[PDB]
Amino acid sequence: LENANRNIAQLNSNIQALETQKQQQADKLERLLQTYYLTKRSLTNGQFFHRSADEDRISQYYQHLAKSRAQAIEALEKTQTELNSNQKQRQTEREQIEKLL
Amino acid sequence: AKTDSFLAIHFKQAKASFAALWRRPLGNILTLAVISMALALPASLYLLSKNIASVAERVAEPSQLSVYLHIDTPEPRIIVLKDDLERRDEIAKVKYISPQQGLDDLSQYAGFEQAISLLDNATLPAVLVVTPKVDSREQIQTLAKALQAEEGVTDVRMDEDWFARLDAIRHLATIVVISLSSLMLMSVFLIVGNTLRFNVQANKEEIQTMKLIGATDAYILRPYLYSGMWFGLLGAVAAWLLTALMTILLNGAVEALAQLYDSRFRLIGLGWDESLLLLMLGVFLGCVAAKVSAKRHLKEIEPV
Amino acid sequence: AKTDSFLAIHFKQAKASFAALWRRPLGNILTLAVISMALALPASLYLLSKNIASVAERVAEPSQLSVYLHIDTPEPRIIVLKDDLERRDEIAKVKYISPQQGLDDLSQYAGFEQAISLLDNATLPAVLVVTPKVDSREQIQTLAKALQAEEGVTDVRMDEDWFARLDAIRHLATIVVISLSSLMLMSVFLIVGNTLRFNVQANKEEIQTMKLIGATDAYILRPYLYSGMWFGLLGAVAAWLLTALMTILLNGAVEALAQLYDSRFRLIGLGWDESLLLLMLGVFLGCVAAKVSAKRHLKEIEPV
Amino acid sequence: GVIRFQQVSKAYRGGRQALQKVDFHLRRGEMAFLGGHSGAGKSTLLKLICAIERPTDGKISFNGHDITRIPNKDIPFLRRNIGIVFQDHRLLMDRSIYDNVALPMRIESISENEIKRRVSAALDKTGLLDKARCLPSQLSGGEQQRVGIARAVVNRPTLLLADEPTGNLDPELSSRVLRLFEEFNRAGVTILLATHDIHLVNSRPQYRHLELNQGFLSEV
Amino acid sequence: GVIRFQQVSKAYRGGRQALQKVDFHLRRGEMAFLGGHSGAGKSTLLKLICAIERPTDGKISFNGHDITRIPNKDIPFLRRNIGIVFQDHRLLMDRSIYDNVALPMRIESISENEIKRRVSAALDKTGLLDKARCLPSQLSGGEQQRVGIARAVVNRPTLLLADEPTGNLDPELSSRVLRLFEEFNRAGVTILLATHDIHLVNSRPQYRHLELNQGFLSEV
Ligand SMILES: Nc1ncnc2c1ncn2[C@@H]1O[C@H](COP(=O)(O)OP(=O)(O)O)[C@@H](O)[C@H]1O
Ligand SMILES: Nc1ncnc2c1ncn2[C@@H]1O[C@H](COP(=O)(O)OP(=O)(O)O)[C@@H](O)[C@H]1O
Ligand SMILES: [Mg+2]
Ligand SMILES: [Mg+2]
């Protein structure tokens, strides 16, 4: 039971770090999604081809923004899955401690 | 002396006419392919015209101006600001989009269902749309500056309002479509008649023998009518298939183009109504051409 | 035994064949109209393609090379890289855009009057552009790519036909061109064949008697060759007239559109050198189709 | 009667007159030879009777119904009653004999089984039942002529017209063809044979002979 | 000689044999009748001679040159030497008589003046010079047959072949046509007439008679 306690502390620290990362990434994703909502640029509403602009450069900006969004969501899913798995294992460890007790 | 039922003779004639196409493979196949292509091209032109018309109608909005409030702004504050803006003169109308309505609009797009669910509480800024009373660009700029300085907003977005250019492009496309469609319809109508004339000339001996016997004119005429109808039906079906195979490629190309920007677009294909009208037009054209050509060439054949 | 010279017989045959078309005015007029329309379709398509290509070339033909720096590179290293690029040859003219400037450009593009907030200062990476000092496009591009790779630049987006790309121009345009060319070849190569088959059939007895007496095959064949050549030539002339009329029709619509944009433009008809190519194509198709179809149909007609 | 003329005369566009005041009457069941010279009006008469060409002067009565100005839409019904045999034995080489003989029935859109039985009966009557499934090319000349006669007579015609049916056959087969026509007449089918062969007509004097000479019909 | 056969025989695709071991020889200037029955090989013989259909067993010599396997490119040159007359008097109804008779010359691309003089001579010889500018429709049957003979003989053929030229004419005109053929033979043109009319051949026994019976040629 004593050994499990140290593992419990390590799991708690990992969970705290994961929660901090989740909050940070949630804020980042929220702001990025809001920026996309602002800069939709839908074609069917005649929002394309702004006059007298570097179309290639603006397209590159949009593509980079979309790629960053995809990477951010992928990382968020990865970290959330890892945190959920650790929490499930941590809860099981507590259940195992109950059996020992 | 028993006679077959009225429908039975017509069905037998139709089956015989369909079977007749196998007599001469090369000519029939080539004419059918040309008919299919000439009926497919106007379909694609009309499809492009309809897409352009739909886009132009969508762009018909009178340069509506969008206003974004701060995400943390209280709901009663937003309501008060909307009421004040409505009270203010030079504003035709005010439309308020709630944060969750905007969230639904954003979720309509692909790839956003997962992120919204993953986020604990998605919070889009309250987007408000104000339609200027005067369409003048100077007035639009002045109103945008005033709204930005109103001290209750975070950003302001304005539209392009390029109605004239799209109207001119639509007019040009309409003229081109009408001209090319007329040319193709005339070409396909005339091509059928020539093949029917050649077929009639091919079996001169049989027609002479039948007219020498007391055969009626309608009996001689029916097989050519049904051959023309089969030509029309097969051509129209092939044209519809080609139109589908072309619209898939065009949709792919337009999606690739719009992918350069983060937004996406899809083409509106021809509806279920259009296909039926296309088949009807093909059948009507084929039957009329076959009837006129065959009858005119048949009047000039004597039994002896 | 006096015999006519080589050219006299050919000239007589040409004149006689031309005169023969008036025996059946309607049959030989409908085929001419069909050929004219089928050949005028691709001509008008090529005319529009040439006009739009000329417009695209006319709008602007500068040369500029853009290089995208990696986001990882910090701000201080930007000045060092700028100095290094300036020192190296062929890099005389250079412009640098700060990430804040890029954000301002993006905000302007979306229609915002002022830079959009809640995007931070790390939205976009820094971008540099280098003018082409060396007229050698290939060598300049290779040198720029090598320099960018050495410096670790994530991407090197040299100016090129991004719109053309490998999606629209690579596939859709080629497919449309191939389809139109195939339609032109089949429609012309088909109706010419059927008309000559019908003409040969109408002269079954004459051909039988001519073969029986001992006429050579070439003598039988030549009149139909010349009839096909006349068909092709007249069809080409009619197609040229039709394209000219179409250009006259579209002049006003194009003028309305061109006026609105900065570039004043006027439709240009087919060049006088292109007309010779059109006539050559028409006569070539007519002669080839006539020879093939007439010979194939004349094989299966015995004297008795 | 089966056919009657009242001072009928025909004048061609060129100005030459094939027929001039020809008048004869046929009673049901009779047979005639309609002899003539190399010119005369035998072929023109056979064309007039079946309404291929209209007359100019007189009137024609088929069964008491005027055929002088029959509307062009009623000609097929009239021709259905008349069977015609030609010297050329017009046959469709592409189709089979069973198809050639069955064409008059199929024109009326008759059921397949009745067509089969009637065609078999006719071919057996003319002695060509065995070769009902062969092409006309394989048959010899006499067989082709008999097939033509069967095709003419399949549809129970009231009047049968022959236009020199024995042009392309030697006298040996001429006798057989004439005997076949005699059998058909015995069956009760009116016939008007047309020939310029004086020997054949002189062979059998039972049937009334009409001589046509330069457009005039003596009727003796 | 003008033509010679060496055990030539023809077998059709169906399996029926028109000719079996037929052998005869013609010397320049002679005339023959080639009598046969309703079947036999008269028409097949006339088709073989002018190379319309090739033989199977033997060999054919025209003027010492083998015609058994003549290449298809040389057939027109051979046919230019042979004139052919048919029972149907094949004529182009659209064109004029002067055009119909002038076709063999125009095929060779001869000058217009020589064509005119030669055609006038031929039409005068056949007695149709007056109606040289009329259409064949207006002419009577005998005139049409004479026009056909003139068209056949215009090009000075070495051998003239007639395929029952008197099928559609009564004996009165048969005599005239036969006398015209006799005159042409006197001129020095070899002829091989073909007919199944025993009376006509028995009328004039001067010319050697070849009887064709079931594909066998007795030559007596
Ligand atoms: N289509 C026509 N135009 C002018 N005359 C014609 C036409 N057909 C026939 N004739 C003439 O009218 C007369 C009728 O001759 P016809 O009865 O046909 O002779 P046959 O019985 O031997 O066939 C003949 O002199 C013929 O030349
Ligand atoms: N195209 C053919 N195919 C098969 N057999 C044929 C063909 N033409 C003719 N025959 C047969 O070959 C034989 C030759 O007959 P033919 O000489 O043509 O008679 P005629 O001299 O009276 O015209 C006949 O038995 C005929 O039926
Ligand atoms: Mg006659
Ligand atoms: Mg014969």
Ligand 1 within 6 A of CB of E140 = yes
The coordinates were experimentally obtained by: cryo-EM
Rounded CA gap, B14 and C154, in Å?
68
Structure tokens given for C282: 């028409």
D200 φψ region: left (φ > 0), alpha (ψ -120 to 50), beta (else)? alpha
What is the rounded distance in angstroms from the CA atom of residue C97 to the CA atom of residue B62? Answer: 35
Pairwise CA distance, residues B78 & B126, whole Å: 8
Map residue E12 onto helix, strand or coil.
coil
Q: What per-residue string of b and e applies to E25-34 under the rule 16 or more CB within 10 Å gives b? A: ebeeeebbbb
Asked whether residue C160 is domain-assigned, the answer is no
SS3 E6: strand
Phi, psi of B140 (to 5 degrees): -60, -45
Distance CA(E45)–CA(E219), nearest Å, equals: 14
**C-beta separation of B232 from B282 below 8 A:** yes
Helix, strand or coil, per DSSP, at residue D3: strand
Pocket test for ligand 2, best of E44, E88, E163, E164 (most atoms within 8 A of CB): E44
DSSP string covering chain B: --B--HHHHHHHHHHHHHHHTTSSHHHHHHHHHHHHHHHHHHHHHHHHHHHHHHHHHHTTS---EEEE--TT--HHHHHHHHHHHHHSTTEEEEEEE-HHHHHHHHHHSTT-HHHHHHSSS--PPPEEEEEESS--HHHHHHHHHHHHTTSS-SEEE-----HHHHHHHHHHHHHHHHHHHHHHHHHHHHHHHHHHHHHHHHTHHHHHHHHHTT--HHHHHHHHHHHHHHHHHHHHHHHHHHHHHHHHHHHHHHHHHHHTSS---------HHHHHHHHHHHHHHHHHHHHHHHHHHHHT----
Same domain, B210 and B294: yes
What distance in Å separates the CA atoms of residue A34 and residue A26, rounded to the nearest whole number? 12
Distances, alpha carbon B184 to alpha carbons B189, C184, C187, in Å: 8, 12, 11
Cα(E172)–Cα(E142) distance, integer angstroms: 10
* Pairwise CA distance, residues E157 & E82, whole Å: 5
Residues D64 and D40: beta-carbon distance below 8 Å:
no
Cβ atoms C250, B176 nearer than 8 A: yes
Three-state secondary-structure class, residue E31: strand
B46 and B190 housed in the same domain: yes
At E6, which amino acid appears?
Answer: Q
Cα(E166)–Cα(E149) distance, integer angstroms: 11
CA–CA gap between residue C145 and residue C157 (Å, rounded): 9
- Pair B151, B260 in one domain: no
Cα(C163)–Cα(B258) distance, integer angstroms:
11
Among left, alpha and beta (phi > 0; psi -120 to 50; other), residue E47 is alpha
Q: Tell me the two tokens of residue B258.
A: 């719009």
Residue B92: φ, ψ to 5° = -65, -50
B131 shares its domain with B110: yes
Strand arrangement of the beta sheet that strand D159-163 belongs to: D31-32, D190-194, D159-163, D82-86
Q: How far apart (Å, rounded) are the C-alpha atoms in residues D191 and D160? A: 5
**Domain membership flag for residue B304:** no
| Secondary structure (3-state) at D87 | coil
**Yes or no, beta carbons of B37 and C198 under 8 Å apart:** no
Residue C233 touches partner B, C-beta closer than 8 Å: no
Among C260, C276, C253, CA closest to C51: C253
Structural domains for chain D: 3-217 (3.40.50.300)
Packing angle, helices C174-202 and C25-59, rounded to 10: 170
Look up the domain containing A79 and give its range: 2-100
Structurally, chain C folds into a number of domains equal to 2
Distance D47 CA to ligand 3 centre (A): 10
Supply the CATH number for residue C95's domain.
3.30.70.3040
Asked whether C217 and C204 are in contact (CB, 8 A), the reply is no
CB-based contact, C52 to chain B, within 8 Å: no
Check whether residue B256 and residue B289 sit in a common domain.
yes
E211-213, strands of its sheet edge to edge: E35-36, E211-213, E216-217
What is the D211 CA–ligand 3 centroid distance (Å)? Answer: 14
CB B199 within 8 A of CB B227: yes
Resolution of this structure in Å: 3.5
CB atoms within 10 A of CB D166: 21
* CA–CA distance, E115 with E108 (Å, rounded to integer): 10
Of C124, C151, C178, at which residue does a domain stop?
C151
Q: Do the beta carbons of residue D142 and residue D173 sit within 8 Å?
A: yes
Per-residue CA distances from C41 to C182, C183, D77, E217 (Å)? 12, 10, 50, 68
What's the CA-to-centroid distance between D38 and ligand 3, angstroms? 8
Own/partner contacts of D42-45, CB < 8 Å, gap of 24 or more, are: D42/D163, D42/D164, D42/D194, D42/D195, D42/D196, D42/D212, D43/D163, D43/D194, D44/D10, D44/D18, D44/D19, D45/D19, D45/D194, D45/D212
CA distances from D163 to B228, D85, D155 (A): 39, 6, 19
- C158 falls within a domain: no
**Which chains pack against E, by 3+ Cβ pairs within 8 A?**
C, D
Mutate to test the pocket of ligand 1, among D12, D13, D48, D216 (most ligand atoms within 8 A of CB): D12
C-beta separation of D84 from D152 below 8 A: yes
CA C59 from centre of chain: 20
The answer on B186 and B129 residing in a single domain is no
CB contact under 8 A, D110 and B216: no
Q: What residues have CB less than 8 Å from C188, skipping those under 6 apart?
A: C35, C38, C39, C232, C235, C282, C285, C286, C289
Chain C residues touching E108 at Cβ < 8 A: 1, 3
Q: Which pair of structure tokens corresponds to residue B105?
A: 């609009």
Q: Indicate whether residue D37 lines ligand 1 (CB < 6 A).
A: no
My answer on whether B44 and B109 are in the same domain is no
Q: Which helix (H) or strand (E) segment is D213 a member of?
A: strand D211-213
Contacts of D107 in chain B (CB under 8 A): 210, 213-215, 219
Helix axes C174-202, C204-213, angle to 10 degrees: 70
* DSSP 8-state assignment for residue C177: H
Distance CA D154, CA D102 (A): 8
The span from the CA of B265 to the CA of A40, in Å, is 12
Q: Are residues B87 and B31 in the same domain?
A: no
Are A and C close enough to touch, i.e. 3+ CB pairs under 8 angstroms?
yes
Cβ distance of B175 and C253 shorter than 8 Å: yes
CA atoms within 13 A on the CB side of D144: 22
d(CA E23, CA C89): 103
> CB-based burial of residue C301 (10 Å sphere; 0-12 exposed, 13-18 middle, 19+ buried)?
middle
**Residue E81 vs residues B289, C213, C241, E50, E154: alpha-carbon distances, Å:** 50, 9, 52, 9, 11
Ligand 1 contacts CB of residue D213 (under 6 A): no
DSSP E52-71: SS--SSSEEESSSSB-TT--
Residue B109 lies in a domain: yes
- Indicate if ligand 1 lies below 6 Å from the C-beta of D14: yes
CB D48 within 8 A of CB D60: yes
Residue B1 domain-assigned (yes or no): no
Q: Quick one: how far is CA C148 from the chain centroid? A: 37
**Residue C171 DSSP code:** I
Let me know: does D91 contact D100? Beta carbons within 8 Å.
yes
Residue type, C246: M
Co-location of B151 and B230 in the same domain: no
Substitution target in A41, A42, A78, A79 with the highest count of B β-carbons within 10 Å is A42
Q: Which residue has the tokens 């990430």?
A: C99
- C-alpha span between C25 and C28 (Å, rounded): 5
What atom of ligand 1 comes closest to residue D42's alpha carbon?
21
Q: C interface mutation test: which of E47, E107, E113 has the most C CBs within 10 A? A: E107
β pairing state of D31-32 and D8-10 = unpaired
**Residue B141: closest CA among A40, C114, A37, A54:** C114
Count CB atoms within 10 A of the CB of residue D40: 23
Question: Rounded to an integer, what distance in angstroms lies between the CA atom of residue C128 and that of residue C140?
Answer: 16
C140 and C81, same structural domain?
A: yes
Cβ atoms of A8 and A94 within 8 Å: the answer is yes
Please say whether the beta carbons of C228 and C290 come within 8 A. Answer: yes
Straight-line distance from the first to the last Cα atom of chain D, in angstroms, rounded to the nearest whole number: 19
Burial of residue D5, with CB atoms counted within 10 A of its CB: 0-12 exposed, 13-18 middle, 19 or more buried? buried
Report how far residue A96's alpha carbon sits from residue A11's, in angstroms, rounded to the nearest whole number: 15
D134 burial (CB, 10 Å; 0-12 / 13-18 / 19+) is middle
Closest Cα in chain C, distance from residue A25 (Å): 15
Here the tokens at position E214 are 């079931």
The answer to the question of residue B146 being in a domain is yes
Last residue of a domain, one of B97, B123, B157: B157
Q: Which residue of E has its CA nearest to C1?
A: E110
**What range defines the domain where residue B224 resides?**
6-59+163-299
- CB of residue E16 inside a 6 A radius of ligand 2: yes
Q: Are residues B184 and B47 both part of a single domain?
A: yes
- Tokens for A86, please give them: 């650790």
Q: Which helix (H) or strand (E) holds A56?
A: helix A55-100
Domain finish residue from C127, C151, C175: C151
Is the CB of C3 inside 8 Å of chain E's CB atoms? yes
| Among B59, B102, B123, beta carbon nearest to A46 | B59
**CA B204 to ligand 4 centroid distance, Å:** 25
Contact C209, E83 (CB under 8 A): no
> Is residue B205 within 8 Å of residue D92, measured between CB atoms?
yes
Tally of CB atoms within 10 A around E7: 12
Task: Answer yes or no: are the C-beta atoms of E87 and E164 closer than 8 Å.
Answer: yes
Cβ contact, residue pair E38, D138, below 8 Å: no
Q: Are residues B45 and B90 in the same domain?
A: no
d(CA C29, CA C23): 11
CA–centroid distance for B284 within its chain: 21
Any chains having at least 3 CB pairs less than 8 A from chain A are: B, C
Classify residue B89: in a domain, yes or no. yes
Give the ligand 1 atom nearest the CA of D12: 4
> Strands, E, within D137-203: which ranges?
159-163, 190-194
Tell me if residue A55 falls in helix, strand or coil.
helix
CA-to-CA distance for B137 and B62, rounded, in angstroms? 11
Q: How far apart are the C-alpha atoms of B157 and C114, rounded to whole Å?
A: 9
What DSSP string runs through C206-230?
A: HHHHHHHHT--HHHHHHHHHHHHHH
Region of residue E21 (left: phi > 0; alpha: psi -120 to 50; beta: else)? left
Other CB atoms within 10 A of residue B77 CB: 14
CA-to-CA dists, residue A25 to A32, B105, B111, B249, D108, angstroms = 10, 23, 18, 39, 88
Angle between helices B204-212 and D97-107 (to 10 degrees): 50
Tell me the angle at which helices B163-202 and B217-259 cross, rounded to the nearest 10 degrees: 150
Q: How far, in Å, from the CA of D185 to the mean position of ligand 3? A: 23
Whether E92 contacts C206, CB under 8 Å: yes
For chain C, the first-to-last Cα distance in angstroms comes to 30
The runs of H, that is alpha helices, within chain C are 6-20, 25-59, 75-87, 99-109, 137-151, 174-202, 204-213, 217-260, 272-299
Which subunits sit against C, judged by 3+ Cβ pairs under 8 A? Answer: A, B, E
**Dihedral in degrees, nearest 10, Cα atoms B255, B257, B262, B264:** -30
- Cα distances from C231 to residues B248, C13, C224, E187, in angstroms, run 39, 15, 10, 49
Residue C69 DSSP class: P
Measure D213 CA to ligand 1 centroid, in angstroms.
13
Q: Residue D60: which H helix or E strand, with range?
A: strand D59-61
Q: How many residues does chain C have?
A: 304
As a whole number of angstroms, the distance between CA A71 and CA A49 comes to 27
- Cα(A39)–Cα(C7) distance, integer angstroms: 77
Q: Which one of A32, A43, A49, A57 makes the best mutation probe of the C interface by having the most chain C beta carbons within 10 Å?
A: A57
CB-count burial class (<10 Å; 0-12, 13-18, 19+) for C115: middle
Query: Which residues of chain C does A54 touch, with a Cβ-Cβ cutoff of 8 Å?
Result: 105
> SS3 of D31, please?
strand
Helix (H) or strand (E) holding E82: strand E82-86
Q: Where are the alpha helices (DSSP H) in E73-170?
A: 75-81, 97-107, 112-126, 141-153
CA dihedral (C68, C70, C71, C75) positive or negative? negative
Is the CB–ligand 2 distance for residue E218 below 6 Å?
A: no
Q: In what order do the strands lie in the sheet with D211-213?
A: D35-36, D211-213, D216-217
| Secondary-structure percent of chain A, ordered helix, strand, coil, rounded to 5 | 80, 0, 20
